[PDB]
Amino acid sequence: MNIFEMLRIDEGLRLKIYKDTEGYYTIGIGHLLTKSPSLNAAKSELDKAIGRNTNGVITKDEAEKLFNQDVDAAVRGILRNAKLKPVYDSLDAVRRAALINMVFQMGETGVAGFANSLAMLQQKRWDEAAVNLAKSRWYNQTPNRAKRVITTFRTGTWDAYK
Ligand SMILES: [Cl-]
Ligand SMILES: [Cl-]
């Protein structure tokens, strides 16, 4: 298992524009297009992203390509974040994947908001962190996904994904 497979499981794959759990236009493997309520605005951002007139539909390879870029950016963004880097650096490979998943979903700013949980993760207090991570809008809105990521930080294994 790895970051790609893990997010593929969490996000799924859709080749037509769809609305995410928050009602925002998305496509592919969790690629957010826009928070604007307008479908045209989304189609437009989509064409700009693919470099062609898609008419709201893309192929698998195009989806995968957006995905690759999205994962790379999440990593790079973690590495540039003063609040995130030290945490990421302190973690083992499996848990690093949980941190990436979270940035992929919520953005760097969103995660930077789990200040208390981050400190716990850095100190390696797994059970306490898990409990704190659960006290969040994140967990109440997407509980199944959240539990998977939390178990991963708690155990350091991929068991929640097997
Ligand atoms: Cl893009
Ligand atoms: Cl969920």
Side-chain angles (χ1 to χ4, degrees):
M1 169 79 47
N2 59 55
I3 188 51
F4 293 87
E5 290 181 9
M6 176 199 209
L7 279 163
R8 170 98 179 50
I9 281 155
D10 283 337
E11 305 283 358
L13 163 72
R14 293 183 75 187
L15 302 177
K16 337 213 148 104
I17 296 197
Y18 63 96
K19 294 203 213 184
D20 77 358
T21 74
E22 304 281 344
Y24 308 129
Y25 287 122
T26 301
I27 194 135
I29 298 155
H31 184 81
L32 172 69
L33 291 164
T34 187
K35 297 170 159 191
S36 159
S38 169
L39 179 51
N40 293 298
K43 265 123 146 304
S44 153
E45 284 292 316
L46 178 63
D47 293 339
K48 167 167 58 91
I50 305 303
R52 89 203 169 56
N53 236 80
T54 65
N55 198 40
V57 179
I58 62 166
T59 73
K60 199 180 173 104
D61 299 325
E62 276 167 347
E64 272 160 4
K65 187 167 206 201
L66 291 185
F67 187 37
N68 287 312
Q69 297 178 172
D70 287 345
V71 175
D72 191 35
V75 174
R76 263 174 319 91
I78 278 169
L79 306 167
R80 283 199 267 92
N81 187 306
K83 280 203 97 251
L84 304 176
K85 187 182 204 271
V87 179
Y88 183 84
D89 280 350
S90 77
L91 297 166
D92 59 274
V94 181
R95 288 180 173 96
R96 273 167 190 191
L99 186 62
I100 295 165
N101 191 305
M102 294 181 76
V103 168
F104 187 95
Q105 178 183 3
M106 66 202 124
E108 202 180 309
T109 313
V111 179
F114 287 67
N116 302 332
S117 300
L118 298 176
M120 293 169 201
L121 286 170
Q122 199 156 345
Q123 299 179 77
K124 315 190 171 289
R125 287 163 132 76
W126 320 122
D127 286 39
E128 298 160 59
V131 167
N132 189 261
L133 282 166
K135 310 176 155 181
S136 63
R137 176 174 188 276
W138 173 58
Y139 180 86
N140 285 102
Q141 301 300 136
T142 54
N144 290 333
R145 186 184 179 149
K147 298 177 174 133
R148 292 193 288 272
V149 172
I150 287 167
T151 292
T152 302
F153 274 128
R154 204 179 33 93
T155 63
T157 64
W158 293 110
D159 291 348
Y161 290 82
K162 301 172 313 211

